[PDB]
Amino acid sequence: EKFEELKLSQPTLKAIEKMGFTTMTSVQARTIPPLLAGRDVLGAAKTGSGKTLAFLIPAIELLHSLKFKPRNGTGIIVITPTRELALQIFGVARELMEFHSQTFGIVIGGANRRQEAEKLMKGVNMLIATPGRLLDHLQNTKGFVFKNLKALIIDEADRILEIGFEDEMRQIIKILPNEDRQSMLFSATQTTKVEDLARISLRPGPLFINVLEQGYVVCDSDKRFLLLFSFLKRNQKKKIIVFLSSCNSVKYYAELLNYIDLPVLELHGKQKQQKRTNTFFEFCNAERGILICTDVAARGLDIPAVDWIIQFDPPDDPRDYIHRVGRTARGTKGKGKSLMFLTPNELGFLRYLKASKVPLNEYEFPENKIANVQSQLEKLIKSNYYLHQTAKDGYRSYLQAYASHSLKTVYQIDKLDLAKVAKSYGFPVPPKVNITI
Amino acid sequence: MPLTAVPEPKRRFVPSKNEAKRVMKIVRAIREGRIIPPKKLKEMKEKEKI
Amino acid sequence: RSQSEREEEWLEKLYKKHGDDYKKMFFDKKLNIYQQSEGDLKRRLLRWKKRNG
Amino acid sequence: KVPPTIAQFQYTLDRNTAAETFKLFNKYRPETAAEKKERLTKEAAAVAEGASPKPYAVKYGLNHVVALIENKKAKLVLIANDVDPIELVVFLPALCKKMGVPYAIVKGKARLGTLVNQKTSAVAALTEVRAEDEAALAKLVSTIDANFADKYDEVKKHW
Amino acid sequence: EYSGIIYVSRLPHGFHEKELSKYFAQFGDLKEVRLARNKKTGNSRHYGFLEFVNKEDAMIAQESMNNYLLMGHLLQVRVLPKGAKIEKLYKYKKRVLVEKGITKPVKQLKDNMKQKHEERIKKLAKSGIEFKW
Amino acid sequence: AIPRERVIKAVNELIKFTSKPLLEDDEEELKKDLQLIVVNNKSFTGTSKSFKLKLLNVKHSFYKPWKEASATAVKDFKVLLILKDSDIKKVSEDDLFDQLDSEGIKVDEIICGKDLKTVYKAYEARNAFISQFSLILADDSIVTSLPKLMGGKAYNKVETTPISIRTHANKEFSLTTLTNNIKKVYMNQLPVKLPRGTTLNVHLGNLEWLRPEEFVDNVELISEQLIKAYQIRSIFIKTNRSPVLPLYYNQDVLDEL
RNA sequence: CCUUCUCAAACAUUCUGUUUGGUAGUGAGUGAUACUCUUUGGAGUUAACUUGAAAUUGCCUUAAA
């Protein structure tokens, strides 16, 4: 089927055309009509299978049907376990609403609380917020208009339960209304606890729908960027995909690499969907180049036959990253080597790697030979305002992602050396980041 | 870590604008026949004093 | 309104150094002494063009 | 006697270290009114008939220096030991120590003012230095640290 | 306790024994001053040892020059414990090559070179590389 | 001249040796890839250990392939130009690029003796800056002052040591003189030092560089010049301290001892 | 707390082309096997790399007073 065969408003149709997706996916084709009808639906759709747009489009349709002013109510609420997923969903919502006149915003853990409170007071008709900060905004912020909750959707309930927000989810359900609220949810899988949570939230009888060496390098925090740059320079003429934990960091790294006179491609949620698809196709068909992508962007995206898979930043979903290699080896003609960067304080991930029992190899590099571009990077940052701002934004995003990592036992902000990270980013003086240390 | 972020302004990474304003004011004064350029002053004084 | 002679000359250098590629002009250290945004540069170029060829 | 915070001053640098610091600072004298005025007039004259790098100067304003500190931008800070409103400078050494910015106490505010074309400068600090003097700046920082923090480690004790 | 022998490092280039003796002679009298030097080249290693007749002079010199800045070098001076007498320190100077091994006749070394070339060919053959002449 | 068959056999043996049956290229990519020829002589320039460099004429110097192949390496090839203080103001980077971009060569930076003594005085900074560039060109006038300003560490290697380049025409500085002398050095010369010892070595570059036949021609051309220059002795083509492959055998030199 | 040996000729005078000469250095440490040499003791050459200018001993008077 196609989006043209649905009762979609003209601005929504124009936005969908701007996205570039005209053929409905199986999950989308099966979920969009029931969602538009208002029936509660839950499923085990895999992440990145287009379910995000699948349940976003009905929300926009409901908003366009009600046509209530931004001051009237809060409209739709979206809960996601991770900050990166929240940013991706907000970007998708903004892309879809470009034509639409409704308001949208985010509430992300570790962000400016005052700004989020002001935005909520102004009125947001499409809110995407993590449960941890969503509870705080619901409880200790006067003027919130959550009383008009029309729809509620939960993404990746299994991850939310695993992190430990089940009590937070119960509190949110208790606080939020249930009179006219239509409840839905989606996740890669669903356990007994997830089923109980769905039963608690989903008011009616919900509709059910179903559808290699672990190479790692131990490098210092300050020298990680230089080592990655040297690896890319000496591995040129190949195809390499780099995984990061922040879209801002990906954009900054891509811009810096382009400025250093070496072609590089970026793939982040903040990029326009049409531009995202064009860049992905160009990288796939080029047969040579380097792609810098975020974890969430490549979570469900197709993986061409790439020679290397580099996990520069800690994975957002450790289990998915651990299990990826098994299928990645079979899915590529030439088994793409997997590379991971581990801080000396991040050696705890070796315990999980051993628990996986997959083959592993410890690569080594000489400290004598390195790109040695620290002085040039510092001069460029101190001389260029745009590059300085991009680097600062990337550093802030990386710190925020690190602080929000579920694996607290392996990753901790306290153990991190801020000075070394700033030097790697090119800042002799680490810019301040509002991290709840 | 420092105390306050205070994102840096462009003026820190950009040449001073007050200096440009003063230079433009001096240019306007010279054009209006109000300020003698230093070279003109030197030329006039060289003829003078003798 | 009108643009100053110095501003017009600087815009002429931007034009016959990069043309219409505002992205490249954004990184022009020699001509773009002030690191202005792409939007401001494009607006100034359009204003200059409206009064010229 | 006086409390530990008082008498922390007057334990200035030795003759050689102070002389070297002042010699280094004399290479970054901010342009006086006449120098800046003549430079601006020359620039105007050039513009009349038809890209310089960032200027380097010593930052000395008390408010400006205090703003520079607590942001780790400053590298060396000079503190006058004869400030009549002592409260204006009592907190500077401890704040610098907390921020880790190297600091020193020099004799006389007029000496600081002379190197900045001012009658009296409460403080004098350096933020950025030329690549030529970067090694010299590091050497002076190390010498000041050795001669002040270790030699006068008890400056914050024994009332 | 501490002895009169003093160890000084971080000596600026050109700060030779004579200059050290002249500068330290003010503090009482110095028994002997020695500066480390390289054998092939006569330049100093930027560290030497000096002995004082009296321990008070040694301690005064150590206090005065503990962290003295000397044209880019912060001199560090230490007073060794009781004993630890200075060892030998040759006054090395520049070494100039002298040629002496040309006494062998040219005829003998011709055959020696031929034999060495044959042995080299045999060795490179033994190394897994096939070559001739 | 020596038959080309021996040189062909030597290069084929080197090619065989380069391939044999832990991520970055520490020393392996340079040990079994470097090509050099060892020339023996009776105390090359025994009178004095001057740092003079001899620019052997080469039809196809490795500089162009070195720049072409330097992209896929951590170390980036660069060219350093050193000129006197008086002539640096006249020399402009834009003019040099415009007059040299046609040939394809580029100049990364231009330096003067004043800069070396003020900004690069520090030993650490001097070492960091010098190591960046692989090709160093210095005005004939300032080469005598360079060793004092730049120290002796840069002279420990052929790449780091300066190379004399003419920049004066009719006793007056001429832009075209430098513009074409740099081209001649880049694509028509091969610098090599003259050590104060019996052994002399010339670095011919990596194995993946100019084709073996071109490598053989370059070796023959270098050997002819060396024979015409000094009373050289047995010559061997050697990889990084790998088995030596003799190429020339001189006997009349021994009788002259 | 001073600064560093910033060119000389022959031919050609297409205004720059050919040939020659002038370059004696912070030290320490690590380190890839060839050259001769005199026979002994090692003398000079030969890849590569770290460094805060780092470091424990190789048997003339006016910057006058």
Swiss-Prot record, chain A:
- What keywords would UniProt list here? ATP-binding, Helicase, Hydrolase, Nucleotide-binding, Nucleus, Phosphoprotein, Ribosome biogenesis, RNA-binding, rRNA processing
For this entry, the protein name equals ATP-dependent RNA helicase HAS1
Motif Q motif, per the record, lies over 1-29
Q: Where in the cell is it found?
A: Nucleus, Nucleolus
Which domain of life does the UniProt lineage start with?
A: Eukaryota
Biological process (GO) annotations held by this record are: maturation of LSU-rRNA from tricistronic rRNA transcript (SSU-rRNA, 5.8S rRNA, LSU-rRNA); maturation of SSU-rRNA; maturation of SSU-rRNA from tricistronic rRNA transcript (SSU-rRNA, 5.8S rRNA, LSU-rRNA); ribosomal large subunit biogenesis; ribosomal small subunit biogenesis; rRNA processing; snoRNA release from pre-rRNA
GO annotation, cellular component aspect: 90S preribosome; nuclear envelope; nucleolus; preribosome, large subunit precursor; small-subunit processome
Q: Does Glycoprotein appear among the keywords? A: no
Keyword Phosphoprotein listed? The answer is yes
The cross-references to InterPro entries, in alphabetical order and at most eight, read: DDX18/Has1_DEADc, DEAD/DEAH_box_helicase_dom, Helicase_ATP-bd, Helicase_C-like, P-loop_NTPase, RNA-helicase_DEAD-box_CS, RNA_helicase_DEAD_Q_motif, SPB4-like_CTE
Tell me what happens on changing residue 187 to A: Slow growth at 18 and 16 degrees Celsius, no growth at 14 degrees Celsius and drastic decrease of the amount of 40S ribosomal subunits at 30 degrees Celsius in vivo
This entry's Gene Ontology molecular function terms read: ATP binding; ATP hydrolysis activity; ATP-dependent activity, acting on RNA; identical protein binding; RNA binding; RNA helicase activity
Positions contributing to ATP binding: 45-52
Residue span of motif Bipartite nuclear localization signal:
223-239
The record lists the effect of residue 64 to Y as: Decreases the amount of 40S ribosomal subunits at 37 degrees Celsius
Q: What EC number(s) does the entry state?
A: 3.6.4.13
User: Domain Helicase ATP-binding spans what residues?
Assistant: 32-208
The enzyme's first-digit EC class, named in words, is: hydrolase
Could you state what the record's PTM comment says about this protein? Phosphorylated by CDK1.
Q: Which reaction does it catalyse?
A: ATP + H2O = ADP + phosphate + H(+)
Curated annotation (Swiss-Prot), chain C:
| Compartments in which it is found | Nucleus, Nucleolus
BP term (GO), one: rRNA processing
Please tell me whether the keyword Nucleotide-binding is annotated for this protein: no
**Protein origin, superkingdom:** Eukaryota
Q: Which residues carry this modification: Phosphoserine?
A: 2, 4
* GO CC, any one term: nucleus
Other observations noted: Present with 2860 molecules/cell in log phase SD medium.
Quaternary structure annotation from Swiss-Prot or TrEMBL: Component of the pre-66S ribosomal particle. Interacts with NOP7, RRP1 and RRP15.
Family statement:
Belongs to the NOP16 family.
The task this protein performs is described as: Involved in the biogenesis of the 60S ribosomal subunit.
Task: State the protein's name.
Answer: Nucleolar protein 16
Tell me the organism. Saccharomyces cerevisiae (strain ATCC 204508 / S288c)
Curated annotation (Swiss-Prot), chain E:
Question: Which domain of life does this protein belong to?
Answer: Eukaryota
Primary place of residence?
cytoplasm
- Regions annotated as coiled coil: none
Subcellular location, in the record's words? Cytoplasm; Nucleus, Nucleolus
List the molecular function annotations (GO) for this entry. ribosomal large subunit binding; RNA binding; rRNA binding
Cellular-component GO terms for this entry? cytoplasm; nucleolus; nucleus; preribosome, large subunit precursor
Q: Does the keyword rRNA processing apply?
A: yes
Q: How does it assemble?
A: Component of the pre-66S ribosomal particle. Interacts with NOP7 and RRP1.
Function (record text) = Involved in the biogenesis of the 60S ribosomal subunit. Required for pre-rRNA processing and cytokinesis. Associates with the precursors of the 25S and 5.8S rRNAs.
Name of this protein: Ribosome biogenesis protein 15
> Which gene is the coding source of this polypeptide chain?
NOP15
Give the residues of the full protein shown: 88 to 220 of 220
Swiss-Prot record, chain F:
Subunit arrangement? Interacts with CDC4, PRE4, PRE6, RPT1 and SCL1 as part of the fully assembled 26S proteasome. Interacts with pre-ribosomal particles constituent NOP7.
Keyword Nucleus assigned to the entry: answer is yes
Keyword Electron transport on entry: no
Taxonomic classification: Eukaryota, Fungi, Dikarya, Ascomycota, Saccharomycotina
Keywords of this protein's UniProt record, alphabetized?
Nucleus, Proteasome, Ribosome biogenesis
Q: Where in the cell is it found?
A: Nucleus, Nucleolus
Q: What else is known?
A: Present with 45900 molecules/cell in log phase SD medium.
- Alphabetically, which GO biological process terms does the record hold? maturation of 5.8S rRNA from tricistronic rRNA transcript (SSU-rRNA, 5.8S rRNA, LSU-rRNA); maturation of LSU-rRNA from tricistronic rRNA transcript (SSU-rRNA, 5.8S rRNA, LSU-rRNA); protein catabolic process; ribosomal large subunit biogenesis; rRNA processing
Q: What does this protein do?
A: An adapter protein that specifically links the 26S proteasome to its substrate CDC4 which is one of the substrate recognition subunits of the SCF E3 ubiquitin ligase complex. Required for turnover of cell cycle regulatory proteins CDC4 and GRR1. Required for synthesis and nuclear export of 60S ribosomal subunits. Required for vegetative growth.
Q: Which GO terms describe its molecular function?
A: identical protein binding; large ribosomal subunit rRNA binding; proteasome binding; protein-macromolecule adaptor activity; ribosomal large subunit binding; RNA binding; rRNA binding
**Stretch of the intact protein here:** 31 to 301 of 376
Gene Ontology, cellular component aspect: nucleolus; preribosome, large subunit precursor; proteasome complex
Put simply, this protein is called Proteasome-interacting protein CIC1
- Highest taxon listed in the record's lineage: Eukaryota
